[PDB]
Amino acid sequence: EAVKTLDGWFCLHDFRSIDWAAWRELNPGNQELMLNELSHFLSDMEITKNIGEGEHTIYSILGQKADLVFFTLRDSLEALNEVENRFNKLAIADYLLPTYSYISVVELSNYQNKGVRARLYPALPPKKHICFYPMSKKRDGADNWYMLPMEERQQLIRDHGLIGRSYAGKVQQIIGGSIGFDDYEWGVTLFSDDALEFKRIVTEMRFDEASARYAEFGSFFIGNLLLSEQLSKLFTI
Amino acid sequence: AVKTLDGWFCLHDFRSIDWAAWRELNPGNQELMLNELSHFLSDMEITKNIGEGEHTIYSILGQKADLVFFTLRDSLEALNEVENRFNKLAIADYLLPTYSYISVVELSNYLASHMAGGDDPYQNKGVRARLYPALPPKKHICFYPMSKKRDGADNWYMLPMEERQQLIRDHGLIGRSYAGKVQQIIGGSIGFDDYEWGVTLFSDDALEFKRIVTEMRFDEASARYAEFGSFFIGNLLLSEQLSKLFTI
Amino acid sequence: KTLDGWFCLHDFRSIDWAAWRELNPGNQELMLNELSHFLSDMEITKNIGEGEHTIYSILGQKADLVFFTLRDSLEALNEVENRFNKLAIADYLLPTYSYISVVELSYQNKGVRARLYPALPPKKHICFYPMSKKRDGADNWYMLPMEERQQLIRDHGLIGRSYAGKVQQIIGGSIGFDDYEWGVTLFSDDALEFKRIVTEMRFDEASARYAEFGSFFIGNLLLSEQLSKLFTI
Amino acid sequence: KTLDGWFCLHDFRSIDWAAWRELNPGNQELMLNELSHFLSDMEITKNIGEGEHTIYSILGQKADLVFFTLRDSLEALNEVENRFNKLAIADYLLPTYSYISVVELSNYYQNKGVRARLYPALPPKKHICFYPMSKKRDGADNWYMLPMEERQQLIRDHGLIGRSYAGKVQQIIGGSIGFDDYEWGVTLFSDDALEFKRIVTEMRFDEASARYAEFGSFFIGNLLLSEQLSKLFTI
Amino acid sequence: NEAVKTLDGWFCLHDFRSIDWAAWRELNPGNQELMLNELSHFLSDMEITKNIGEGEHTIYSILGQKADLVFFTLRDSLEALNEVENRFNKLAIADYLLPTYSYISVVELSNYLASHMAGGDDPYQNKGVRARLYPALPPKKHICFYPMSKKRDGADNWYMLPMEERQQLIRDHGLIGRSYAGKVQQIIGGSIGFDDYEWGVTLFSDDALEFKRIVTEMRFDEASARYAEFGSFFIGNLLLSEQLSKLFTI
């Protein structure tokens, strides 16, 4: 009955809110020193990306939930843990307050193939916007995904995939499985150059039976790509 | 599935004033920080006057917040830039974040907003007035997020289109009967925030908020399918009310 | 259809004893003097008929105090709240919960005016809780026909009548104003009457099937003398 | 319809070890001496029959301690709480949970057995368990819509289970409708903490709880007398 | 109707902590060392209790913001467990270890299935049973923790089911778990009466993906599909003395 999956990079979505009042009290020399240290840290992460042993990206997040998200991908939980711990020990991380995080593993569901590696070990597209949310499938009375027969679940998933293929080109998705790893069953990351495409795809999916009857959603987070020019601007008072 | 037209991107930014810290500042430094906020708001008025957005400020009742800054912009980048420049104001260290909401002004296709045809609605001036709304200087504001239920036999997203259309139609008749008393902005937020809409109401009589929201609650579209978040109520704040608000 | 009266704020505060303790007694006195001035201001509004207010000490950790204020506009209620937060002593009164509502009765009449603009009785104890009516499957209050709801509300009223002289109730409507649909304040000289009336109502179908409750707060009347004792440390 | 006895406060605190550690030992001793005089005053009220109190250390992060106090009026209880909060040492006792209730005897004052239950002597048992609970009002599982006779029978069967733990678990049931966020506060005392797991598990398979009980958080701890109270605070 | 009966072993604490890096950064290295020396002395005291058979303990670093560390401690009484917790909080370094979550439970063996022959013997004298009630912790690379309860929700009410139906559901769940022998080791802590859910579940494995595999497969089995209510999930990596010193080096 159970789904069986292929699993790739381990993923951390690390959401931070900048402690502006504390940062503002810092002398501008201390600020520059801490950003230089962060800049070294990110150069090291770019080395790891270039040799194909992981990926990362940063977006600035709208609203009070976070000021930015660091999305990091590594080939082991140990390498992910080490990134996280070294990040937290940067001087600047004292000003980056933790507001939410998500742990997952890139997931390919069964419902060396170079086209499988490309999904399991995803290169992150440098799209203008990111959208992140976690979700689970419902187990609530007669709306119970995990009691459905495989044939009915397969049909529901087929219909859901038709919708998403129509947003190919517009929206790129990474699906992280998180059963056993975090509080929901998947972490969904979308990338697009038009944020309204996130609204469009997620709305269209909500009226398809697989989500209409069986999806449970967490919080949603949207943001704008942060390269270095925008990163240094972010922190300049 | 519903199709939407989408207009300005919206931020409702709720803040609580840290009176104890503010009180520790001498009045010289308080004036300097208020001067910097006025310059900031003057810049926001320029953006409004060139047609690139809108904004307004209300004082909020109760402990949820002291102020809401409601800002509308033509891109997420611009909205993000307002937010970030605002947090970097000196006075913002005394404006503690207590809640926020991201949405986009939305017109659905459940009913018609313009004569059908090849003519695209974004060129219709009546449609544009609704997608890119002028904010009215009404005495009061009411904000709350909401979603439509997906709960056993009460599942909005499993209804056929013609049934959702009828429910929305009937909801709209109620709303139309508050013309000239309540003005509404509906921001869609599927994909953007934690509920599916952010609802902003404006009225000169706060009791009209209770009236319409109560009346709609006995209409099937809300009685059976609405799920509500927190409600925020407040009073219009112009310059006079603002320097006054911060005089301790 | 409802008639609406004074706008209401329930403002719950926990006292920051650690910081209050750090103040020398002279500065404590100055802050209490300012607070007494503010409260005498509130009493003036009461005595001219433009509002009401009362203060109860709250049991348990949810709060030390509740300030229950009633005013004739949202602007006036907002001004009181803001002037309150600007008192020096308010820096030691940490906000832990609040509720906004309007006195509700479903205007030239004296007994109606007495309901819509209620005098606050100096009863020994207070009980506050918000509530809503369920919209949950077959237990959906707002999908009931008019005549069924009327019968359900009728029966709940008979229970209330039996507590005349034991419990006095103020019902604030809060649809559009706060997170629940009503704020319920009860006053009695015997706190056990709160438990009795609220239990009795819970077995009545209007509440048994359709009530959804928030947190409950219970307290003892604070006059000027008990206020000075509260803060003596 | 119920009989109601002492009003009850369960006051849960976590100790601010970092701040406590900054105090020099003479000041630490002065604050503990003040707490000693406060507790000896509480012992007078206990000795004269006007209330009760006990202290347990609580396992896990929810709390380090619970102060469980019973008084014959809400005013007396409020006065205990406020005086406690104004102790110097209370700055180091951070509030993490509390519960207000009244000792309750349903029908599902001059009598000596009734009085022993309404105004209960607290047993010096090694362990305490506290949790609040309410009865469900959820579709077909609605306690408050049940006929009186059906409720009577469900309570009867529940009481039979409780009777079988006589001599192992002693219970205080506090009614809290109108007073706090659930409908009852449940306090269990036993010298064997596994008896808590046993009695609460067995009740959960009895219809009265299986269908109708809604539980809050659970707290368990160990009796703190004077000997253990000083050691708790010694760094 | 017929309640489950259990055998109960060591009392357990899962103690999750987040490191206050900002504060720790402000200490000079000599004072950091003294605090780590004192911690190493406390852990060697824990090791002594392990080596005389009166408890167990282990430390994992936790991924994500929920915690940096979990200290999982097992002891033969609630008093001993409470004494360990209190001595830990009074370490100097514990000021830098902020509490983010905890769980209290007791190693549980229920009677849904047999754990030993019904020949009249004291189960607590059966060494196989003792190995389960007083479990040696395996030094597996990864840990997974989550609490859970069984639903009492309308037609999905575990506690209204007949004994023989619950036994069938537990039996089927066990066959799935049996298939992960050698890949995932489980400790089930019962927590009815002790904490906010009904069990705390700890999984150990050298491959973190086996956690996802077993939890997913059980979620399609009726016992969980229909009746499980889950809390938060925590996953982590084994921390020995060496990885601990690195964790705290800035």
Ligand code: FEC
């Ligand atoms: C295609 C495409 C898009 C759109 C972006 C694009 O343009 O590529 C796309 C986007 C989304 C989005 C949002 C969500 C979450 C929103 C929601 O309402 O659930 C979203 C949700 C899920 N998808 Fe999705 N998708 N998707 C596939 C295709 C696409 N999908 C294929 C294929 C599979 C593989 C199914 C299989 O073989 O097992 C697949 C699997 C899942 C599962 C796993 C469910 C389960 O295992 O039970 C969840 C949850």
Ligand code: FEC
């Ligand atoms: C009219 C009117 C009022 C009253 C005030 C005024 O007239 O200014 C008015 C006020 C409200 C108020 C409160 C709420 C909040 C719901 C509640 O309190 O139960 C409230 C709620 C919603 N309305 Fe509403 N309205 N409203 C329309 C008409 C009016 N509406 C038309 C028409 C559309 C159709 C879209 C469009 O026209 O662009 C429409 C759409 C929505 C949606 C989106 C529903 C969906 O897509 O599923 C939600 C939620």
Ligand code: FEC
């Ligand atoms: C009588 C009496 C008491 C007891 C105190 C006394 O001794 O008078 C009294 C006390 C309470 C108490 C607790 C509660 C809240 C607890 C609950 O379980 O409902 C409580 C709850 C409500 N009452 Fe209540 N009452 N009450 C009326 C009579 C009395 N009532 C009459 C009549 C009306 C009719 C309207 C009005 O005049 O306000 C009325 C309205 C409401 C509504 C509005 C419901 C709705 O409109 O859907 C709610 C909620």
Ligand code: FEC
């Ligand atoms: C006996 C006994 C024990 C075990 C400990 C011992 O042996 O002392 C005992 C223990 C417990 C325990 C746990 C709980 C909470 C666990 C649960 O799953 O609800 C627990 C729960 C309740 N009990 Fe309980 N009991 N109990 C009675 C007898 C005993 N009871 C008698 C009798 C009455 C009725 C008294 C009267 O009619 O005057 C009574 C009433 C209640 C109510 C009130 C419910 C209601 O009124 O709707 C709740 C809740």
Ligand code: FEC
């Ligand atoms: C075997 C095996 C595994 C394999 C993984 C491993 O070895 O690490 C194993 C692993 C798990 C895992 C995940 C979970 C978490 C459930 C989920 O994520 O859906 C999980 C969950 C539970 N198990 Fe589990 N198990 N398990 C048993 C066998 C195994 N179990 C036997 C047997 C008993 C019964 C004891 C007995 O009678 O002997 C038993 C009991 C429970 C209960 C308590 C149920 C109740 O009393 O209502 C819960 C909750």
Ligand code: NA
């Ligand atoms: Na932000």
Ligand code: NA
């Ligand atoms: Na306010």
Ligand code: NA
């Ligand atoms: Na209090």
Ligand code: NA
């Ligand atoms: Na503790």
Ligand code: NA
């Ligand atoms: Na971590």
